[PDB]
Amino acid sequence: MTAIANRYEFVLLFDVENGNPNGDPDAGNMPRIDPETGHGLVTDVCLKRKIRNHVALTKEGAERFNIYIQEKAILNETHERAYTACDLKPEPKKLPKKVEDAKRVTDWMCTNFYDIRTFGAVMTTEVNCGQVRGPVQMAFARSVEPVVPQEVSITRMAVTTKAEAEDNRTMGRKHIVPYGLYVAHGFISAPLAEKTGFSDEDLTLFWDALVNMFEHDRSAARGLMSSRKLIVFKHQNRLGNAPAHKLFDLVKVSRAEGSSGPARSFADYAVTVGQAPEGVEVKEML
Template structure:
């Protein structure tokens, strides 16, 4: 399980939201992100990676090799300093640091799961190099256009005594999507795992767990009900792969059952996998 992965993978993940905001846009008053030309909803790769990081943090509890580099409240230069201490290098000794940057980068890859998976730019004041991770995820896009709703809510309490003389409650707003099913696609490079970060078979299994369970540890009033519905994995028989990724993705189609009414649940869709499109050397695995 600790061996570096030897095969290339791609995957398709389907997840949904009910009466929640899956990924607010701070440039639009935190309304759900949307493609203005098509009306389809968007969830960024950064948002999905954040949830995977949080899941790993919950499961591993800071175990050796499974620290999280980009975490809430983290000061990245202090994370880098751990590599300097481990290699007996003074952070102010830039000449020695440049000479041993590979050792510093290796320490960061060995000790932080998210660097090993997603890579990181660590060329700040305390330089630990830069790595491109083997795991990359596209923006998720909703299957159908979404409806952004702004719902007015009330709080039966006021903030201070001055407000109490004027009113008996506070008004607020929540931004929700009544229902949407999203699709994201991802890539895992065995070449980058071997040559750069050392992403292992154990890391891979943890990634699959994270993709399946990430929403169960991320519930909040703002996000409503979110869940991973399907995780479909394409496993190649070699490191370089046996087919173009886009051809594999085309074998998974999501169809709306009844277009005459708005969708309000996962059962309003059919997920169709055309296995006849799979070339020799590619194994399709339904993780969920």
């Protein structure tokens, strides 16, 4: 599996309409916000989870495309599978002494699992299996404008257990964002892909997952979520030709002059992409 040979930076713009893009376990289930400014947040972990889900759905557990962080899997069992495939006796807390055996087990895990191959993983559990860094990384997604989450109160006409509460129906509540445009930055590293095996077919599948990330993630709390723009910057050499922060600044998002009042649809925003440096190109076709 020949690895990629170019550094990539990408910017993803996705929406949410009367939905809850990512709940906050500490503040009930309210959408994550930056309390000092009000801007919404979506952990990179959530986006990685959605990408994993899309990969699993579109590959149906085909060979070399299993996903490591599954719904109910036990990680120690997967590491034991790797050790059995490598024909080794696993010490509890330690990697195999022979460094080549440790490399073999880690390479097996990287090869037969897609998300380990892409995002990396930590496997130093009671059956150690090494560590991987992961060529593809992405930071938090932050709304262009402050969001205004609102509490939706709902009821149910049934009661789980034996209770005489209902003289009024059982209560409950949702949390929704009336609308929010989020910007997600991400990086792809050729040097790490060389060590991990992240190939070009993997890159194509990753782009497809980003484009169709939300189309199969519908639920009772998500509302209508969609990916609007996907700008990809491709460098011509393993090490980039321009700092990333310069490239991300080329994607300017601002409210359209013809719009006023709170934003409620993507038409309220205008996105402009500037000219990239000579050593880079922009794939603004996604």
